[PDB]
A paper describes a structure:
GmPOPB is the macrocyclase responsible for macrocyclization of amatoxins, eight amino-acid ribosomal peptides with the core sequence IWGIGC(N/D)P. Amatoxins are cyclic peptides further modified by a characteristic sulfoxide cross-link between tryptophan and a cysteine, and hydroxylation (the extent of which vary). GmPOPB is an unusual enzyme catalyzing, depending on substrate length, proteolysis, or macrocyclization using the same catalytic machinery. The protein contains two domains as observed in other POP enzymes. The domain containing the putative catalytic residues (Ser577, Asp661, His698) comprises residues 1–81 and 450–728, and the other domain is a seven bladed β-propeller, comprising residues 82–449.
Author numbering:
A (entry chain A): 6 to 727
B (entry chain D): 9 to 25
The structure:
Amino acid sequence: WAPGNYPSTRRSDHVDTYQSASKGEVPVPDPYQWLEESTDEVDKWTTAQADLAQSYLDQNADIQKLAEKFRASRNYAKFSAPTLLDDGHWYWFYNRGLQSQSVLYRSKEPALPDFSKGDDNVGDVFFDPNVLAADGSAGMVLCKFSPDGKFFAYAVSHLGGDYSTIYVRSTSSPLSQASVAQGVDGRLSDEVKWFKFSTIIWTKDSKGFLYQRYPARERHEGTRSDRNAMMCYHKVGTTQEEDIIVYQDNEHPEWIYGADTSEDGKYLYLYQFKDTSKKNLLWVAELDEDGVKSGIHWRKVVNEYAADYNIITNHGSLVYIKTNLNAPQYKVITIDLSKDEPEIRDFIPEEKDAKLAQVNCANEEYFVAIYKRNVKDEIYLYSKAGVQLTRLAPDFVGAASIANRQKQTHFFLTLSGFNTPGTIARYDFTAPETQRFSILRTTKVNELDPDDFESTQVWYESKDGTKIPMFIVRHKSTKFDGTAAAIQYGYGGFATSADPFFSPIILTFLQTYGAIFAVPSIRGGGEFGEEWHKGGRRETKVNTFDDFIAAAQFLVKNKYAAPGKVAINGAANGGLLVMGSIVRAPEGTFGAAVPEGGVADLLKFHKFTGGQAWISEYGNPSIPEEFDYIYPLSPVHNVRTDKVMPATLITVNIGDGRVVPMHSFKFIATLQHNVPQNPHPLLIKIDKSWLGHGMGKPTDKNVKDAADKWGFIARALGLELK
Amino acid sequence: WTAEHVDQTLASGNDIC
């Protein structure tokens, strides 16, 4: 491979004209507009690019060595927290190690298993999603048992599809390799099509469930777009023709919907969302003992877009809600619906400097809360009177989630972090006062010893003076003496927190090469609440990029990493982050760049699939004042001819409907046009398996792709196997 | 945040009933 040998890429004469508040009419050539399309010319181009990328990777014998190490690092048994259904049995997911989809197991006995005996010794298969299609073309993307434990609803996607289909089966009818060989599927004839972008919410009478669906579309009808969502109700044992439309809004075709049902059967809740801002409406209906019927009466409790409201529970007409209303770090309020003018009060007040991330009601009257303080989760138990009783797992450092059912006398915590593979803790209210908290299961990994790795948090300063924390992970033999390479990962938007997580592949890379992993908590994320998001959003989105570039500069200046040896990686918004960072940062700031499925055409993102929802994140290119801050940031529109680019390996999936791949296609074509003689390769990989909505790749392909990515980075930074 | 890069089995039973 050598510079200047990129595929022949036609440049059209297409020009789009935008309105700028400061400059008036702005003509913007789009010579690669044709890469938005699906044609034989595009297929020739993608094939040529993918062949070039693979030819380059074929030169690197270390990639196969990394595949071997990475596959081994993933080859350990994995499991979820178990859930106790109303049949008395416990159900949990189990992966033997390298299965592409984990398998839902049910306890042999109606008692909590001793999991030290082994999953197959204490449980039998209930639902194996790998058998949904013999060829692996179908995946289970979401599931939900009914409250009575009698039924299991499950959403299935297929390769090539843009929606999921919900099926229902009795909990007494397993789906396994044995059951398929021995008889018919076992499911009911119910087939609930066109499901997308909501949860499955059973009514507490177990008669049916709420789900969001879209209009049916014939193959050649319409465009690839999801509009005119409907919140619907499906009664078990019926066809979809009988489903009830609970809510839709023809006046606002872009809005989407969610629902919840109170444990006591009294209330149905409707949430409405207009964009990706964390603002929502909240309406409340009273259900009578007959449950959901047509013609529901909504009380419009929250009827303007101003804040995030999510129901926790209710006691009678007193509804407990997690909200950021006048509280950017979140809090719990009560809204008392027995009043005509609801009374609103703080139950758990906002903490100025810790985000309230999750609250669940447990054992009927208690509350379990997770606070994210300095991007590290803390777990607390609260009484019915709102008294903080105790901190649970006080020495845990990482990310935590709660799993429970309110009526039950236990809850679980799932705990993980950079060196914590996955611990499931149990709190049992029936146990003696000092014996209530225990460890149910700890994930045991393969080859790696998590104790060999350390994570710390350091603080650096961005351009504008803001102090930003950053996690640094290392194998403990690695010194911060200005010699290590660094992989710096980010997302940087949508109030998504860049939380600790366990990755055996990353740890294997760190140990193999003596490298460090860096995760800066840049603005645009949610780590410090709404104000942190607002600090990198719309007109302040540039701050996200400044924060990410400053992190890389800090790693080198302060001797965590060697000059030229910071590589960057991110996906979706994180791919935008990577692509904009390499355009904007001083030459030589980065040694390698891997944007995955990234946004890059910030002038047209709102014209494809669900991109209009991101106007709350990026601004609206059609508004002149907003064009003026978008255009200078858009990576496709800011490539220069005079800056050396780091080695770059862009990766996309051809079927991606979240971020259409034209973003990356235009970006790579623009790079290759502007700096064809760049000294470092500028390459793109294009996976041509068209994943259905919500579907993942097979494990073997994920391992192969990880080896290509991390091997590319290692070679670009000059790292050798030692 | 980590959909493709991290196995999600650990959290997959957090909200199934």
